[PDB]
Design a protein around this nucleic acid. Structure first.
Ligand SMILES: Nc1ncnc2c1ncn2[C@@H]1O[C@H](COP(=O)(O)OP(=O)(O)OP(=O)(O)O)[C@@H](O)[C@H]1O
Ligand SMILES: Nc1ncnc2c1ncn2[C@@H]1O[C@H](COP(=O)(O)OP(=O)(O)OP(=O)(O)O)[C@@H](O)[C@H]1O
Ligand SMILES: Nc1ncnc2c1ncn2[C@@H]1O[C@H](COP(=O)(O)OP(=O)(O)OP(=O)(O)O)[C@@H](O)[C@H]1O
Ligand SMILES: [Mg+2]
Ligand SMILES: [Mg+2]
Ligand SMILES: [Mg+2]
Lengths: 104, 401, 398, 441, 193
DNA sequence: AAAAGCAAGCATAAAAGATCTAAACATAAAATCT
DNA sequence: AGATTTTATGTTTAGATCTTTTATGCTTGCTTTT
C-alpha cells in the first residue's frame, strides 16, 4: 500500500539523517505529513497512521516498543535499508524521499 | 431448581435457543435495487466462490486433500494482514472437501474448529475441541486427558480430523503448553490430526514460538498478500452482480483509496455500504462519485482541526501556548508552570484576561479528556507534564485559516 | 428549606451564608437536587459537624435517606458500597451484599418510588481527598450517581483541598463548589462567646465565691476576657476548637483575682504567654543504659561530623549516612575504656534503631553484609544532655 | 398567598428541567438522523451495524442516544423486534462483569432471576452459541457501550472482538454502538478488532461556538414553554412511560402556568438577557467553557436563589453567580491562614525568588523566618514546634508538595505562583504592617 | 498506682468528637510492660467497664490489617469474657455487634497500642482518624505505650491528627528505681538462704 | 614529594511498570449420615 | 428423601517476571594539598 511505502521511506530517511534512532510514532508522523504535503497527496491522520504502522509491523520490517500513550510508541527498524529498498520496489519514489532532507 | 438447567447445559442436552421476532421479516420482492446492493455488499455475505483467491484455494486444497487421502496428519501455518480472505478461503476449502466426502469421492473426515480470541484462557481450547467431539462441557484437565486418550491411542476405525485454529498468537502465553500439545498431537502416528493455524504476523514461529514448537510447526506455509488496486475492484463488482447502481469510477475510487491504506476488503465493503446509504438520502438511485467521496471523507475521518476550531477561546489560547513553550524550550514535554506563563503572555497580547490557574487546570483536564493533549492527574499542579498530542502546525491551521 | 436553616442557625453562629446556600441547593426534598456538591475549607471550619447536623435535620424533618462516610475507612471500594447501601437501604439486615459498583447502582435503582411521596437521598463523604487514591472509578461514578441511579440524590463531598486537585486523566462531571471561609477575629470572638451560659453554669455549680462570681461574670466580662485572649492567641492559630480548649483553661487561671478580691491583664499575661508556647500540644527525660548513651552520641558524631574529619578527630543538606562499622569505630574512639564486642552491644544498636533514635535510610535487607546505612535522628541538645550525665564533652569533637 | 406559590412552581419547573430532561435534544439534526436510521435499519432489515459516537465531554451524546431510543421504542415494531443491552465502562470494569450483565439483560436461559451460573468461559461460550444459533428470524440486539475507551482497556479486548465479529457474521443482527469522549479511541483497538469495526464515526461537537447561539440557549433554558408544548411533551413522555430513565423523568404536565405568568416571566427573561451586564457575564462564561453542562450548572445556581421575597431574575444576580464562578480558590485558602503560616509562605516565596525555584526544606524556611522574627517585634514568642506544626498545616493543604528522610529535613516544592501570594497580600484581613513590609523585601 | 489511675480514666470516659486517649510514658524496657497491660485488661474486665483490644506493631503493617486485627480483637475479647473470619471483620460489623450487645445497657472499647514507636506513621494516623470518625457512635479509648518521650508523640502526630486528640499523660516508675527496689527487698532479704 | 579530592565509567542494583503466574479464598457438586 | 462435610472448581489478590530506566555506589583515573 502506498501509505505504507511513504511510512517506510520516511522512517529510512529519519534513520539515515539522524544519529539518534529513538524514533517515536509522533516524531515519525510529523515528518510523514510534511513528506505527503510535498508529494501533493493526502496524508492519514494519527489514528489511521498508528494502524498503518501496526500493519507494517506484521511483516517483520519493524518492531514497536509500546509505551503509555500511542504517540509515545517507539518504532524500531528491523531490516537494513538495502533490504528495505529492494522490498519497496519503487526506486523512483525512494530516490525522491531520501533526497528530501528539507522536509525533516 | 437451577442445577438441573446447568446439568442439561453442561451435558449439551438443551440447545441454546435465542428469542424469535414477533413480526415476520419483510419479503425480498419489496426491496429497492439500492437496498439489494446494500445487502449484497454486507461483509457477512461470503460469496460461494471467492474472487482473486484462486491460487491460495488450490494451495490449501492440495495440502488438505493430500493429508486426508494419505491418512497421515500434519500441520500448516497460513498468515496475513486482516481482511485478506484467510478464514473465508480455509472454510471454503473445508466446505468443498465436505461436499466431496458427501459424494464418496474422498474419505470422510471430522472438522473441529476453534478461535483463540473466543477463549478466556489458552487452556480452554481443550474444553472446546472436546465440545466439538462429544458435546459435553467438562473441565480443561479432564478434557485434556480425554483428548490425549483419543489421539495417542490407536483406535480403528479412527477417522481423519482437521483442526482449524484461528488466532494462534492468543494461545501462546509463556509456558506455550497448549500450542505444544496442538502441534505435537499430529506427530504421533495414532492421531490422524491435520491442524491448520491462521495468524496475522508472517514471522510468528520465529518471533514468539519456542524452538521445538517452531520445529513442530514445520516449513509448509502460505501468506495472503494484501488486495491490490484491481482485486478490490473485482471483489466489489462481484458483490454487486449485474446491477449498475454503482458507477464504475465510484468503485474504482473506493478500491484506489482503500488499497493505498491497508488492502483490507472489509473497508471497501463498508465504504460501499456507506456510499449506498448516502445515495439513498439524496433520492438518487445510482451511487455517483461524489457520494463515494463523501463516504470516504467520513470513514477515513480526520476530525482534529474541527476539534481545535470548536474549542473555547481560553482553550485555544492554551493550545497556542503549549506549542509556544515547545518551540521555546525545544523539548516536547512541558510543565504546566511555563505553559501558564506563556498563557499570560498570549492573553496579555490578545487583551482578554485569563482564568486563574485553578481554572486553567480545568482547561488542561478538558483537553486531556478530549485527548487533544496528554496530561497527568491534576493533583500535582504547576509541575504536571503536558505533552501536545495534536501536531503543532494543526493548531495554527485551525486558528488562522 | 426554611425550617432546616432556622434549626441550624442557633447551633452555628457566623454560618448563615453557608447554611443558606446548603438550604437552597439541598433543602427541600420535593425540589430536585444538584448532582454533586463540594464544600471545602480549612481544619476547624466546621464542615463535618455542619453536614452531620444538616443531614440529621433533613432526615428527621423530611423523607430523605442520609448516608455519612469517612473515606479513610474505605480502603477497598466494597466497604464504601456496603456502608452506603446499609444507610440508603435501611433494615436490610445481614442479608445485604454488594459485589462491585454495578450491584450498588442496580440496588439503588430498585429504591426508586412514585413522585407523589417526594423522597430524596443524600450522601456526605468526609475526607474526600482519599477518593482520588483508590480505584479511579469511584469518584467519576459518585459525581454522576443521580444520572446513573435515576434518583433524586446529591453526593456531598468534604475535603480540605480545592477541586482543582481532583481532576483525573479522563475528566469529571460538573460539581457545585462551595467554600467555607475561616473566620476573622470578630466572628471568632462571637463564636467563642456564644457558649457563655455553659461556662457561667459551670462556675455556678462550683460560698462567698459563688455570689462574688455571679455578681461579676456578666457578658461584658467574658467578652473582654476573650478580647484579651484573642489579642495574643489569634496570631498563632485561627482554629476554633483549639481556641476553645485553650481559652477555658486560660479563664480558669484568669478568674482568680476576681474571686479573691483592666487590673487583670498582667496577672493573666504571665500565664497567657506560657500557654502560647504549649499550643497544639493537647496535654492535660529519656533514661538510657550507659553504653546505649555512648552508642547514641557516637551515632550523632557519625551523622554530624562527615566522613573525612574522623581521621583527624579520632586517630589520636541533612544528617549524614553512616555504616555500622563507622559507628563502632567512633564508639571505640570516644569510649576510652574498650569493652568487648559482646552480643549485648550490637543488640543495643538494633534496639536503638527500633525506638526511632536511629533509622535505616538504606540497607535494611542486608544489615549483616555491611551494605546497611544508618542515620541518626536526634537533636543536638539531647546529645549535650547525655554528655552532661555521662561526662563526655561532645563539643570537643564537633 | 398565590404569588408566593407560582414562584415555587416556576422554580421547581426550571430545576427539574435543568436536571431531569433526559430525552430533549437541541441541535444535531443530521447526526441524530444517522443514528436513528442506523438503529431503524438494524431493527427492521436485520442489518448488523456498528457505530461510534465521539465528541467532547458535556456535549449531548447520552442525550442523543436517549432521544433516538425514546422516539424509536414506542413504535411497537422496534419495541417488539429488538432487545437493548446497555453497558457502561465505569461499572463493568472487567470482561466477566460485562458478560454477566449481557447474560442478564438478554434474558438467556442460564440467567434465571439475575444470578448467572457458570464460569466466565461457560458464559462466553453460551453467549456466543446463542448468538450463532440465531439468524434474521431472531430478535435484533442493540448493544450500547458507554465509556467505550475503558472497554478498549480490557484483556485481549476480547469482549470487543466478540461484539464486532457477530456484526461481521451471518448470525444474530446485533448493533454495537460505542459512545466515548476520546477523539482517538480507534487507535486503542487491536488490528483485528479495528478491522471488524465499521469505521463510520459520528462527531458531536457543540453547535454554539458563536456567542449568539449561547445567548439563545441560555434564553431557551430559562423561558417557560407554551402550554400546548407542555401537552405535547407530556404526551410523548406518557408514550415512553407506558412501555431506564422513565421512572424519574421531567413529566411536565404536573406544572401548568397561567398565560399572564408565562408572559411576565418571558418578558423579564428577555429584558435581563438584553442587558450589557448579563451579556458580559455570559461572555466570560462562554469564553471559559462553551459546553452546555457548564451553563446548566450556572443556571442551577442562579435558579436556586429565587426566594419568594425576590421573585425575579436580574442582571446583578447573574453577575453575582458569575463572580462566584471566576474567583481563584487557592487565594481564598491563603486568606484563611493565620499570620504565622502566612509568614512561612512569605519566607518560602523569598527562598524561591532568590534561588530560582530550588527545592526548600523546613530548616531553611525556619531559618529565613527566624531572621525576620528576631526583629519582627510581634513574632518573638513562637516556639520552633509551633512553626513546625504551621509547616505541616501548609503541607496538608497541598500548598507545599513533596518531591516524589526526617519530616524536618524532607525537600519540598511551592505549589503557588508568586502572583497568587501577591494577591493574598492585598486580600488579607488585618495584616500587621511588619509582615507587609517584610513581604516587599 | 498507675493502674488505678488508668482504670479511673477509662471509667471516667465511660461516665460521659475527639477520642479520649492516655499516653503512658513507660520505660525503654518494652517486653516487661506486657504484664502491665495484661493487668489493665484484667482490671477492666473485672469491673465490666470496658473491652480491650491490643494492637501489636507486627499485626498492623497496613491500615486494612490494623482495622481487621482491631475488630477481631474486640469481638474475640468479648467472646472470651463471657469465630468470624478475619476477611469480614469490618468496622461496620463492629458497630452492628456493639448495637446488638451493649446498646441496651456503656462499655468502653479500649485499644491498647503497646509499641507506639514501632508503628508505621501513616497507618497510625489513618487509624486515629478512623477511630475519631466513630466517636459518639462507638466509645473508643486509646491508651498508648511510649517508650521514649512525649516529643515523639508530638512529632508523629501532625496538625490534622492532633486536632482530634485529648491525651493525658501517665508516668510509669523508672527502671533503675525498680532494680534498686528488687535488689533491696529480694536479693538482700534475710529470709532466703 | 604523600595522601586526600574531583570528573569518568562500567556495574550491581533499584525503581518501576507492565505482566504473567501460583497459592489463598470463596464456592459449587457430591458422597455421606440421618 | 433431606442435612453434612467433601471435593472439585473458579476467582482474586499477592507475589514472581520481563522490561525499561534511572542512580547511587564501586572502582578508576587523574588531581592536588601537606
Ligand atoms: N477475495 C474475496 N472475495 C470476496 N469477499 C472477500 C474476499 N476477501 C475477503 N472478503 C470479505 O471480507 C471478509 C473477510 O473475512 P475473513 O474471515 O476472510 O478475514 P480474515 O483475513 O480471517 O481476518 P482476520 O485475519 O482479522 O481474522 C469476508 O467476510 C468476505 O465476505
Ligand atoms: N461556626 C461555628 N459555630 C460553632 N461551632 C463551630 C463553628 N465552626 C466549627 N465549630 C466547632 O468545630 C468543631 C469541630 O469542627 P469540624 O470537625 O466540623 O471541622 P472539620 O472541618 O471537620 O475539621 P477537619 O477538616 O480537620 O476534619 C465542632 O464541635 C463545632 O462545634
Ligand atoms: N444537544 C443537547 N441538547 C440538550 N441538552 C444537552 C445537549 N448537549 C448537552 N446537553 C445537556 O448537557 C448535560 C450533560 O449532557 P450529557 O449527559 O448528554 O453528556 P454526556 O454525553 O453524558 O457526556 P459524557 O458521556 O462525556 O459524560 C445534560 O444535562 C444535558 O441536558
Ligand atoms: Mg480470521
Ligand atoms: Mg472533619
Ligand atoms: Mg454519558
Amino acid at each position: 500500500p502506498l501509505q505504507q511505502k511513504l511510512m517506510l521511506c520516511t522512517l529510512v530517511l529519519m534513520l539515515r539523517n539522524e544519529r539518534n534512532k529513538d524514533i517515536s510514532m509522533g516524531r515519525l508522523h510529523e515528518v510523514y505529513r510534511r513528506v505527503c504535503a510535498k508529494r501533493n497527496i493526502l496524508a492519514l491522520d494519527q489514528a489511521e497512521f498508528t494502524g498503518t504502522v501496526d500493519l507494517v509491523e506484521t511483516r517483520g520490517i519493524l518492531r514497536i516498543m509500546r509505551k503509555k500513550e500511542p504517540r509515545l510508541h517507539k518504532v524500531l527498524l528491523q531490516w537494513d535499508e538495502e533490504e528495505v529498498h529492494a522490498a519497496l520496489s519503487d526506486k523512483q519514489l525512494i530516490a525522491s524521499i531520501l533526497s528530501d532532507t528539507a522536509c525533516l | 431448581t437451577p442445577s438441573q438447567k446447568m446439568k442439561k447445559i453442561r451435558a449439551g442436552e438443551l440447545s441454546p435457543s435465542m428469542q424469535q421476532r414477533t413480526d415476520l421479516p419483510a419479503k425480498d420482492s419489496s426491496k429497492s435495487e439500492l437496498q439489494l446492493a446494500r445487502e449484497q455488499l454486507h461483509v457477512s455475505v461470503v460469496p460461494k466462490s471467492l474472487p482473486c483467491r484462486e491460487r491460495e484455494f488450490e494451495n490449501i486444497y492440495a495440502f488438505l486433500e493430500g493429508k486426508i487421502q494419505d491418512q497421515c496428519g500434519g500441520c500448516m501455518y497460513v498468515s496475513g494482514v486482516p481482511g485478506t480472505g484467510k478464514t473465508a478461503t480455509v472454510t471454503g476449502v473445508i466446505r468443498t472437501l465436505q461436499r466431496m466426502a458427501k459424494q464418496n469421492e474422498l474419505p470422510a473426515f471430522e472438522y473441529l474448529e476453534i478461535n483463540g480470541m473466543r477463549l478466556t484462557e489458552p487452556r480452554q481450547a481443550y474444553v472446546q475441541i472436546y465440545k466439538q467431539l462429544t458435546g459435553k462441557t467438562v473441565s480443561w484437565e479432564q478434557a485434556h486427558a480425554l483428548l490425549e486418550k483419543r489421539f495417542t491411542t490407536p483406535a480403528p476405525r479412527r477417522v481423519t480430523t482437521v483442526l482449524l485454529v484461528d488466532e494462534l498468537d492468543i494461545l501462546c502465553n509463556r509456558r506455550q503448553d497448549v500450542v505444544y500439545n496442538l502441534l505435537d498431537w499430529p506427530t504421533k502416528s495414532a492421531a490422524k490430526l491435520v491442524v491448520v493455524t491462521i495468524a496475522n504476523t508472517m514471522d510468528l514461529p520465529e518471533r514468539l514460538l519456542m524452538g521445538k514448537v517452531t520445529s513442530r510447526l514445520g516449513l509448509t506455509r502460505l501468506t495472503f498478500q494484501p488486495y491490490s488496486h484491481k482485486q478490490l475492484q473485482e471483489i466489489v463488482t462481484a458483490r454487486l452482480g449485474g446491477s449498475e447502481t454503482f458507477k464504475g469510477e465510484a468503485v474504482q475510487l473506493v478500491a484506489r483509496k482503500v488499497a493505498a491504506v491497508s488492502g483490507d476488503a472489509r473497508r471497501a465493503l463498508d465504504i460501499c455500504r456507506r456510499a449506498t446509504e448516502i445515495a439513498d438520502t439524496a433520492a438518487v438511485k445510482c451511487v455517483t462519485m461524489l457520494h463515494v467521496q463523501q463516504a470516504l471523507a467520513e470513514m477515513i475521518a480526520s476530525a482534529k482541526v474541527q476539534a481545535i476550531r470548536n474549542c473555547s477561546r481560553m482553550e485555544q489560547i492554551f493550545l497556542q501556548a503549549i506549542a509556544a513553550e515547545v518551540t521555546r524550550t525545544g523539548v516536547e514535554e512541558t510543565t504546566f508552570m511555563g505553559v501558564y506563563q506563556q498563557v499570560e503572555t498570549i492573553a496579555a497580547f490578545m487583551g482578554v484576561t485569563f482564568p486563574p490557574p485553578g481554572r486553567a487546570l480545568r482547561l488542561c483536564s478538558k483537553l486531556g479528556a478530549e485527548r487533544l493533549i496528554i496530561s497527568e492527574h491534576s493533583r500535582n499542579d504547576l509541575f504536571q507534564k503536558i505533552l501536545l498530542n495534536v501536531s503543532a502546525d494543526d493548531i495554527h491551521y485551525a486558528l488562522r485559516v | 428549606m426554611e425550617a432546616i436553616c432556622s434549626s441550624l442557625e442557633p447551633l452555628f453562629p457566623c454560618r448563615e451564608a453557608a447554611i443558606e446556600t446548603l438550604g437552597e441547593l439541598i433543602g427541600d426534598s420535593s425540589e430536585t437536587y444538584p448532582s454533586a456538591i463540594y464544600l471545602f475549607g480549612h481544619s476547624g471550619t466546621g464542615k463535618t459537624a455542619l453536614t452531620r447536623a444538616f443531614l440529621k435535620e433533613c432526615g428527621k424533618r423530611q423523607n430523605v435517606r442520609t448516608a455519612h462516610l469517612n473515606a479513610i475507612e474505605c480502603y477497598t471500594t466494597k466497604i464504601m458500597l456496603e456502608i452506603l447501601l446499609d444507610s440508603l437501604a435501611p433494615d436490610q439486615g445481614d442479608a445485604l451484599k454488594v459485589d462491585n459498583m454495578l450491584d450498588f447502582v442496580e440496588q439503588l435503582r430498585r429504591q426508586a418510588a412514585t413522585r407523589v411521596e417526594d423522597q430524596g437521598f443524600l450522601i456526605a463523604v468526609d475526607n474526600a481527598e482519599r477518593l482520588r487514591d483508590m480505584d479511579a472509578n469511584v469518584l467519576p461514578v459518585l459525581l454522576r450517581l443521580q444520572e446513573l441511579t435515576n434518583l433524586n440524590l446529591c453526593v456531598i463531598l468534604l475535603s480540605q483541598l480545592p477541586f482543582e486537585k481532583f481532576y483525573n486523566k479522563t475528566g469529571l462531571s460538573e460539581i457545585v463548589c462551595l467554600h467555607l471561609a475561616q473566620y476573622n477575629k470578630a466572628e471568632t470572638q462571637r463564636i467563642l462567646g456564644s457558649d457563655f451560659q455553659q461556662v457561667r453554669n459551670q462556675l455556678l455549680e462550683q460560698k462567698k465565691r459563688l455570689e462574688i462570681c455571679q455578681e461579676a461574670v456578666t457578658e461584658d466580662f467574658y467578652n473582654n476576657y476573650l478580647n484579651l485572649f484573642l489579642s495574643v492567641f489569634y496570631k498563632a492559630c485561627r482554629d476554633v476548637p483549639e481556641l476553645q480548649l485553650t481559652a477555658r483553661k486560660c479563664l480558669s487561671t484568669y478568674l482568680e483575682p476576681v474571686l479573691d478580691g483592666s487590673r487583670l491583664w498582667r496577672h493573666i499575661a504571665g500565664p497567657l504567654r506560657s500557654a502560647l508556647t504549649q499550643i497544639y500540644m493537647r496535654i492535660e527525660s529519656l533514661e538510657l543504659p550507659y553504653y546505649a548513651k555512648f552508642l547514641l552520641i557516637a551515632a550523632f558524631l557519625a551523622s554530624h561530623n562527615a566522613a573525612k574529619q574522623d581521621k583527624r578527630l579520632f586517630v589520636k543538606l541533612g544528617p549524614k549516612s553512616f555504616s555500622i562499622d563507622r559507628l563502632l569505630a567512633i564508639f571505640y574512639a570516644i569510649l576510652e575504656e574498650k569493652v568487648g564486642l559482646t552480643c549485648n552491644l550490637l543488640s543495643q544498636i538494633s534496639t536503638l534503631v527500633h525506638l526511632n533514635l536511629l533509622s535505616f535510610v538504606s540497607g535494611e535487607q542486608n544489615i549483616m553484609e555491611g551494605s546497611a546505612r544508618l542515620q541518626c535522628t536526634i537533636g543536638l541538645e539531647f546529645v549535650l544532655q547525655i554528655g552532661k550525665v555521662v561526662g563526655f564533652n561532645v563539643r570537643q569533637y564537633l | 398567598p398565590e404569588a408566593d406559590r407560582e414562584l415555587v412552581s416556576i422554580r421547581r419547573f426550571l430545576k427539574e428541567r435543568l436536571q431531569r430532561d433526559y430525552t430533549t435534544l437541541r441541535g444535531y439534526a443530521k447526526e441524530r438522523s444517522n443514528v436513528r436510521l442506523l438503529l431503524q435499519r438494524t431493527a427492521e432489515m436485520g442489518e448488523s451495524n456498528s457505530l461510534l459516537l465521539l465528541g467532547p465531554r458535556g456535549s449531548g451524546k447520552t442525550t442523543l442516544i436517549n432521544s433516538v431510543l425514546a422516539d424509536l421504542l414506542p413504535n411497537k415494531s422496534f419495541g417488539e423486534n429488538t432487545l437493548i443491552v446497555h453497558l457502561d465502562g465505569n461499572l463493568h470494569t472487567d470482561d466477566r462483569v460485562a458478560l454477566k450483565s449481557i447474560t442478564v439483560q438478554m434474558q438467556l436461559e442460564n440467567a434465571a432471576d439475575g444470578k448467572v451460573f457458570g464460569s466466565f468461559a461457560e458464559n462466553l461460550a453460551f453467549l456466543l452459541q446463542c448468538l450463532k444459533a440465531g439468524g434474521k428470524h431472531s430478535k435484533s440486539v442493540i448493544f450500547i457501550l458507554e465509556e467505550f475507551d475503558l472497554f478498549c482497556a480490557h484483556h485481549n479486548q476480547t469482549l470487543l472482538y466478540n461484539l464486532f465479529d457477530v456484526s461481521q457474521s451471518a448470525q444474530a443482527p446485533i448493533c454495537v454502538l460505542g459512545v466515548t469522549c476520546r477523539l482517538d479511541v480507534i487507535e486503542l483497538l487491536e488490528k483485528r478488532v479495528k478491522s471488524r469495526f465499521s469505521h463510520r464515526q459520528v462527531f458531536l461537537f457543540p453547535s454554539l461556538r458563536r456567542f449568539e447561539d449561547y445567548v439563545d440557549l441560555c434564553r431557551d433554558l430559562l423561558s417557560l414553554p407554551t402550554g400546548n408544548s407542555l401537552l405535547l411533551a407530556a404526551e410523548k413522555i406518557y408514550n415512553l412511560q407506558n412501555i431506564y430513565f422513565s421512572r424519574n423523568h421531567f413529566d411536565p404536565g404536573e406544572y401548568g402556568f397561567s398565560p399572564r405568568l408565562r408572559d411576565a416571566w418571558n418578558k423579564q427573561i428577555c429584558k435581563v438577557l438584553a442587558t450589557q451586564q448579563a451579556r458580559s457575564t455570559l461572555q466570560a462564561l462562554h469564553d471559559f467553557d462553551i459546553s452546555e453542562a457548564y451553563l446548566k450548572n450556572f443556571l442551577f445556581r442562579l435558579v436556586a436563589h429565587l426566594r419568594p421575597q425576590s421573585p425575579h431574575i436580574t442582571a446583578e444576580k447573574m453577575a453575582a453567580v458569575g463572580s462566584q464562578f471566576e474567583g481563584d480558590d487557592k487565594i481564598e485558602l491563603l486568606c484563611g491562614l493565620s499570620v504565622l503560616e502566612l509568614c512561612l509562605i512569605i519566607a518560602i516565596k523569598h527562598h524561591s525568588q532568590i534561588y530560582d525555584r530550588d527545592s526548600f526544606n523546613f530548616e531553611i524556611i525556619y531559618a529565613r523566618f527566624s531572621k525576620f522574627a528576631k526583629v519582627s517585634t510581634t513574632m518573638q514568642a513562637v516556639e520552633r514546634s509551633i512553626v513546625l506544626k504551621a509547616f505541616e498545616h501548609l503541607r496538608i493543604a497541598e500548598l507545599i508538595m513533596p518531591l516524589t528522610v526526617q519530616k524536618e529535613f524532607e525537600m519540598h516544592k511551592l505549589a503557588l505562583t508568586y502572583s497568587q501570594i501577591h494577591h493574598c497580600m492585598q486580600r488579607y484581613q488585618a495584616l500587621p504592617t511588619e509582615v507587609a513590609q517584610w513581604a516587599q523585601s | 498506682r498507675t493502674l488505678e489511675q488508668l482504670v479511673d480514666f477509662v471509667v471516667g470516659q465511660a461516665e460521659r468528637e475527639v477520642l479520649p486517649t492516655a499516653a503512658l510514658l513507660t520505660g525503654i524496657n518494652q517486653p516487661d510492660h506486657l504484664s502491665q497491660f495484661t493487668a489493665l485488661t484484667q482490671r477492666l474486665h473485672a469491673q465490666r467497664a470496658a473491652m480491650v483490644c491490643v494492637l501489636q506493631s507486627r499485626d498492623c503493617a497496613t491500615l486494612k490489617a490494623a482495622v481487621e486485627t482491631l475488630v477481631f480483637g474486640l469481638v474475640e475479647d468479648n467472646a472470651e469474657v463471657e469465630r468470624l473470619r478475619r476477611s469480614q471483620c469490618t468496622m461496620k460489623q463492629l458497630k452492628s455487634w456493639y448495637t446488638n450487645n451493649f446498646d441496651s445497657e456503656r462499655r468502653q472499647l479500649v485499644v491498647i497500642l503497646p509499641d507506639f514507636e514501632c508503628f508505621n506513621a501513616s497507618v497510625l494516623q489513618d487509624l486515629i482518624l478512623i477511630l475519631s470518625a466513630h466517636c459518639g457512635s462507638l466509645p473508643f479509648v486509646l491508651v498508648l505505650g511510649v517508650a521514649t518521650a512525649m516529643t515523639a508523640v508530638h512529632g508523629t502526630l501532625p496538625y490534622h491528627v492532633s486536632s482530634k486528640i485529648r491525651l493525658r499523660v501517665f508516668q510509669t516508675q523508672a527502671a533503675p528505681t525498680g532494680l534498686n527496689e528488687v535488689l533491696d527487698k529480694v536479693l538482700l532479704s534475710p529470709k532466703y538462704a
